[PDB]
Amino acid sequence: DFSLELPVRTNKPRETGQSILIDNGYPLQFFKDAIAGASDYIDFVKFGWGTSLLTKDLEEKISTLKEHDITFFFGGTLFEKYVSQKKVNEFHRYCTYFGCEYIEISNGTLPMTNKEKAAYIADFSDEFLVLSEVGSKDQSSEEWLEYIVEDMEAGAEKVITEQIVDDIISSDIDINRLIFEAPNKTLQQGFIQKIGPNVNLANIPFHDAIALETLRLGLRSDTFF
Numbered sequence: 028d029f030s031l032e033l034p035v036r037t038n039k040p041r042e043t044g045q046s047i048l049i050d051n052g053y054p055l056q057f058f059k060d061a062i063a064g065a066s067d068y069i070d071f072v073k074f075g076w077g078t079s080l081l082t083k084d085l086e087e088k089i090s091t092l093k094e095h096d097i098t099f100f101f102g103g104t105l106f107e108k109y110v111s112q113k114k115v116n117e118f119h120r121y122c123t124y125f126g127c128e129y130i131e132i133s134n135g136t137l138p139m140t141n142k143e144k145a146a147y148i149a150d151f152s153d154e155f156l157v158l159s160e161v162g163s164k165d166q167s168s169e170e171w172l173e174y175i176v177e178d179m180e181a182g183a184e185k186v187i188t189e190q191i192v193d194d195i196i197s198s199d200i201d202i203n204r205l206i207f208e209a210p211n212k213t214l215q216q217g218f219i220q221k222i223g224p225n226v227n228l229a230n231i232p233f234h235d236a237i238a239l240e241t242l243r244l245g246l247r248s249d250t251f252f
């Protein structure tokens with residue numbers, strides 16, 4: 028018809044070539060409108076850090092996501108916030124209440140060793156599919172690789188990280204088990220170029236739902252070839 032030869036993409040449910048968008052507090056109607064228009068290319072939606080706590084229409088947002096076959100989870104900073112106040116059980120009851128399938132565990136803010144973080148991954152892994160994050164919001168050499176393996180051994184479904192670390196990873200660690208944060212076009216195109224059309228990416232802004240897919244398909248100049 029108007030057919031073109033394009034890179035082969037994974038289809039939902041995606042276990043690879045996943046796209047995780049970040050919701051920084053979008054109003055409900057715009058949220059529904061955005062999800063409806065690009066759902067086929069959205070696999071996860073992360074409710075940024077502690078924004079979910081101040082979201083009055085959280086229930087409706089989650090319902091809209093489930094309805095469009097999209098997984099959700101709360102930012103790892105929320106987990107850390109409850110840990111910092113010794114209320115991990117409330118966090119657990121919070122994720123369970125909203126029917127979370129996935130949850131993020133990180134140690135980017137709260138001073139905590141990856142080892143301690145891994146223990147939390149292990150504790151929650153028998154109830155949730157865990158996405159862990161390696162890195163701090165603030166040092167560390169290739170201990171990075173160690174933390175990734177450690178996280179995986181603890182039970183992390185996938186590991187989120189922040190481009191040479193890419194080549195370093197190509198040391199027998201399945202690249203498909205990793206998710207790379209790419210909040211802008213430059214980062215997105217770079218990861219797609221090094222790993223391919225089905226690289227797993229996170230922190231994708233809502234306005235890039237369609238745009239990211241064009242990058243994966245070589246429908247934009249940056250990845251044309």
